[PDB]
Amino acid sequence: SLKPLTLLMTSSTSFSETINQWADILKTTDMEKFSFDSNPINLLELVKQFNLYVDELAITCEANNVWAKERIDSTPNLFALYDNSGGEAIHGHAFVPYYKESIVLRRLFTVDPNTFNLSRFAAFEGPCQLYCKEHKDSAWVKIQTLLTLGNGIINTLKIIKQAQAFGIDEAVTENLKALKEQFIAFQLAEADIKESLKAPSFAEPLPNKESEFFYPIDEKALAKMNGYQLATICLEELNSPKPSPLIERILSNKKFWKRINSAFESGVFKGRTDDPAGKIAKIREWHQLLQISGKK
Amino acid sequence: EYDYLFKLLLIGDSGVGKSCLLLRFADDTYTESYISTIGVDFKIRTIELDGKTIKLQIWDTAGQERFRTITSSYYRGAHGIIVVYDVTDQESFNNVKQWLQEIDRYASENVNKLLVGNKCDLTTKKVVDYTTAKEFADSLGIPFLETSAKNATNVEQSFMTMAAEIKKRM
Numbered sequence A: 001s002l003k004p005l006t007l008l009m010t011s012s013t014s015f016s017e018t019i020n021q022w023a024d025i026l027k028t029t030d031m032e033k034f035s036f037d038s039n040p041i042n043l044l045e046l047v048k049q050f051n052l053y054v055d056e057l058a059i060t061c062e063a064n065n066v067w068a069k070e071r072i073d074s075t076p077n078l079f080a081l082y083d084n085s086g087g088e089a090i091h092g093h094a095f096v097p098y099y100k101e102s103i104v105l106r107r108l109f110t111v112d113p114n115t116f117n118l119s120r121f122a123a124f125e126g127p128c129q130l131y132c133k134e135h136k137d138s139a140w141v142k143i144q145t146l147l148t149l150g151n152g153i154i155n156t157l158k159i160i161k162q163a164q165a166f167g168i169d170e171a172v173t174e175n176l177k178a179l180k181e182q183f184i185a186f187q188l189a190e191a192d193i194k195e196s197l198k199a200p201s202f203a204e205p206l207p208n209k210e211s212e213f214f215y216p217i218d219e220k221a222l223a224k225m226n227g228y229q230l231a232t233i234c235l236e237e238l239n240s241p242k243p244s245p246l247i248e249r250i251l252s253n254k255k256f257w258k259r260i261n262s263a264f265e266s267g268v269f270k271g272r273t274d275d276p277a278g279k280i281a282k283i284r285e286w287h288q289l290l291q292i293s294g295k296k
Numbered sequence B: 001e002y003d004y005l006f007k008l009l010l011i012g013d014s015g016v017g018k019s020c021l022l023l024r025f026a027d028d029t030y031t032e033s034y035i036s037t038i039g040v041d042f043k044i045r046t047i048e049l050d051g052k053t054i055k056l057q058i059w060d061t062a063g064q065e066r067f068r069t070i071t072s073s074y075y076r077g078a079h080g081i082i083v084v085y086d087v088t089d090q091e092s093f094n095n096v097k098q099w100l101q102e103i104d105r106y107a108s109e110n111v112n113k114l115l116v117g118n119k120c121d122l123t124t125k126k127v128v129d130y131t132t133a134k135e136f137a138d139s140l141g142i143p144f145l146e147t148s149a150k151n152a153t154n155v156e157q158s159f160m161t162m163a164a165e166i167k168k169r170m
């Protein structure tokens, strides 16, 4: 009878070292002499810890102003040039060129702890994979590599737990091989990023009093935005706690409302995991409020 | 306690319907809600044919480019791959080309293919004519079905067909 093996987790230790620990265990153990038990493995906590890492990473990119390092335009964000959506909604999101990259980052990578999957941020998925093609070596590529590995690890383990549950051994055995490889791969990628994160020499651009999510959007630019687009923006701003100056602008302006609303009624937002129904209602409220106030 | 075990694989662009297909077919349900599959997942339904009972180990894959490392692992093991495109999505069809290439690059020598045009119920928003698709399909002797995972339209028939097509080759 061969020793039982599992990959446990200390209560507060971070994703990075957690991986690193498992990385040792997996490297230094002749996996032939053990029988792997995935039951004690705490996906939920790992997911929690990972999303927490995604967040921290996102924060430093913004803070170190990594994105400015990474420009050649003044096009509203790194990916703007790569949108061919025609401001359509794509699985609940329209493309809005003003999104901060660090928001884009979080949304392509954080893991829905509920599903161990991704909540669609679709409008940027094409533009992003495009930018990647035309900018190997770019921080976004290096970062996304790293984060995808993150994602991978989680998925692998889920697949192991699941396969064990159904006795599918071919899978469980092979997936352990892979997991180890993802493990190292992750550790490399983690090292490799450290350069790409270095704060450029040009000074920190001055904070945006108006939104947590979008770069500034002047009234000219905002006006060219469509129903789905403004709609998309409203839903995003509701991820702040206090109402934003930006959403107030949008909701106060009488011209923007018809298209915002029809966007809503169109139903493209129905399937969002971010309580669309609730958000929509609240947006309607705030709009109703505002039109009362602007009746002077 | 089963007669056969076929390993199946759905590939295709992101959001073309792979997972709703797998879901309607396995659990006979559908959720409107927007989730993108990470890496892979697998569901297992047992089918009966001729009238041997066949266990289907169906593996769902992520469409995105960045998952390819992973998805590509599960290619060699598959008895049959279903490539899926979304009939209202032009590029998704244009992409079948690469998807077929990825099959050549990764899966077995003799893997059983199947082209599926999903979201067929969206009549007004459609853009890929059954004909044009079916011709391309026939160009390569790969069976082809339009389907709506939402409506159930042909989802059952699709996996049946893929399964039968496999037994024939065993």
Ligand SMILES: Nc1nc2c(ncn2[C@@H]2O[C@H](COP(=O)(O)OP(=O)(O)O)[C@@H](O)[C@H]2O)c(=O)[nH]1
Pocket (backbone or CB within 6 Å): A091, A271, B012, B013, B014, B015, B016, B017, B018, B019, B020, B021, B031, B032, B033, B034, B035, B036, B037, B063, B118, B119, B120, B121, B122, B147, B148, B149, B150, B151
């Ligand atoms: N009308 C219609 N919409 C669909 C159908 N299948 C998928 N969709 C929509 O497209 C989304 C993406 O499907 P999903 O299974 O996530 O695609 P995957 O990324 O290929 O697995 C779904 O959540 C639905 O909103 C279908 O058969 N008919």
Ligand SMILES: [K+]
Pocket (backbone or CB within 6 Å): A039, A040, A041, A042
């Ligand atoms: K557990």
Ligand SMILES: [K+]
Pocket (backbone or CB within 6 Å): A056, A057, A060
């Ligand atoms: K960091």
Ligand SMILES: [K+]
Pocket (backbone or CB within 6 Å): A238, A239, A240, A241, A242, A243
């Ligand atoms: K709020």
Ligand SMILES: [K+]
Pocket (backbone or CB within 6 Å): A212, A239, A240, A241
């Ligand atoms: K927040």
Ligand SMILES: [K+]
Pocket (backbone or CB within 6 Å): none
């Ligand atoms: K729909």
Ligand SMILES: [Mg+2]
Pocket (backbone or CB within 6 Å): B015, B018, B019, B035, B036, B037, B061, B062
């Ligand atoms: Mg999917």
